[PDB]
Amino acid sequence: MKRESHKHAEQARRNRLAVALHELASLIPAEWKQQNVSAAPSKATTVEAACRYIRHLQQNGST
Amino acid sequence: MKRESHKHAEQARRNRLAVALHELASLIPAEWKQQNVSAAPSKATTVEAACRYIRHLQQNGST
DNA sequence: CTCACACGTGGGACTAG
DNA sequence: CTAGTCCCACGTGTGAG
């Protein structure tokens, strides 16, 4: 039963979710992801602010 | 000594990272995605994407 | 303690024999 | 049926502070 690999595999898989996610804040220019309620530089929070630098960025109507 | 049952501490906390991936999905452009090689619609595979957009949105107009 | 975390695990679409 | 892929998510033993 390939769960034997599914391990070696679904690890590589769950890993991808990291390399990249890592590589988001890795260069979230918006360094405020450095300064706030941030209870963890690893997933969630970083991603909360990760959507943020974009959230600033999606400003499309300069007066 | 909830060193087993503390359980919920994971997902009840994980939930954020879920939607973090999700708001990361709200301000990302489907219309963009055509550029990106389809990976599969996953809670990992698209963290890949938010980078793409972001890495991009930065140098907007530069020529 | 409270956090955050990476492992296995059963797994349920989907596909190729 | 049989198993090989996908990627989802829970339940945890652990380090860290």
UniProtKB/Swiss-Prot annotation, chains A, B:
Biased composition range(s): Basic and acidic residues: 1-10
Highest taxon above the source species: Eukaryota
Domain bHLH, chain residue ranges per copy: 1-57
Subcellular location: Cytoplasm; Nucleus
PTM section of the record: Phosphorylated by the cyclin-CDK PHO80-PHO85 at five residues under high-phosphate conditions, preventing PHO4 from activating the structural PHO genes.
Function: Transcriptional activator that regulates the expression of repressible phosphatase under phosphate starvation conditions. Binds to the upstream activating sequence (UAS) of several phosphatase encoding PHO genes. Inhibited by the cyclin-CDK PHO80-PHO85 under high-phosphate conditions.
Domains (record comment): The 9aaTAD motif (residues 75 to 83) is a transactivation domain present in a large number of yeast and animal transcription factors.
Subunit comment: Binds DNA as a homodimer. Interacts with transcription factor PHO2 and binds cooperatively to PHO5 UAS. Interacts with the cyclin-CDK PHO80-PHO85 and the CDK inhibitor (CKI) PHO81.
Protein name: Phosphate system positive regulatory protein PHO4
Covered residues, full protein: 250 to 312 of 312
